[PDB]
């Protein structure tokens, strides 16, 4: 499901930035390496995603050094990742509790 | 805040699990979720109907008729839960490897 691929890619890209400011080609290599070559991101895909995240204030950019454009997770972005991770833990709990409670009937 | 696209996902995630554990009707679903959430999540009836209309359209669930309307997980539905779970395992692995590789990046330098 397209809805899901998008989410997972975003998930990953934010984790990369959560590990350090980086530029598009560095991000691509890092992901290709952490995925054992299973996820080879196109440049244009990253620009698409980052344009949305920059508009929503979840990331921002700036010039580094060979002059590269760097991307960073904002404070809001670290906050969304935190809210997200928490909300999903509760969800996994509630699922366990559904099972538990169902069996006790 | 939590993007609306994500609250929807979480709710769907939960609802499919309920159905994965047995065909059920809206009131039973609501009750079950309220109980398994220690009251923290009360789904509104009309919200369930809206979600189930989408899932029925996508054939993820189907329904049948005491007098309660029941909802069941289809085989497509069982399959998407499996694909979902697997896709997300790989994703967690990728993220574990990002951490790992970052730490050994940091050792060397």
Residue numbers in the entry:
A (entry chain A): 5 to 69, 74 to 113
B (entry chain B): 3 to 67, 74 to 117
Question: What are the paper's exact sentences on this?
Answer:
Next, we investigated the incorporation of pSHF into Lactococcal multidrug resistance regulator (LmrR), which has been demonstrated to be a highly versatile protein scaffold for artificial enzyme design. Here, we report a new class of artificial metalloenzymes featuring a genetically encoded thiophenol for binding noble metals and the application of this design approach by the creation of an artificial gold enzyme that shows efficient catalysis of abiological hydroamination reactions.
LmrR_V15pSHF is envisioned to have two specific metal‐binding sites per dimer. In most cases, there was substantially more of the metal adduct detectable for LmrR_V15pSHF compared to LmrR_WT and LmrR_V15C, showing the potency of pSHF in binding noble‐metal ions or complexes.
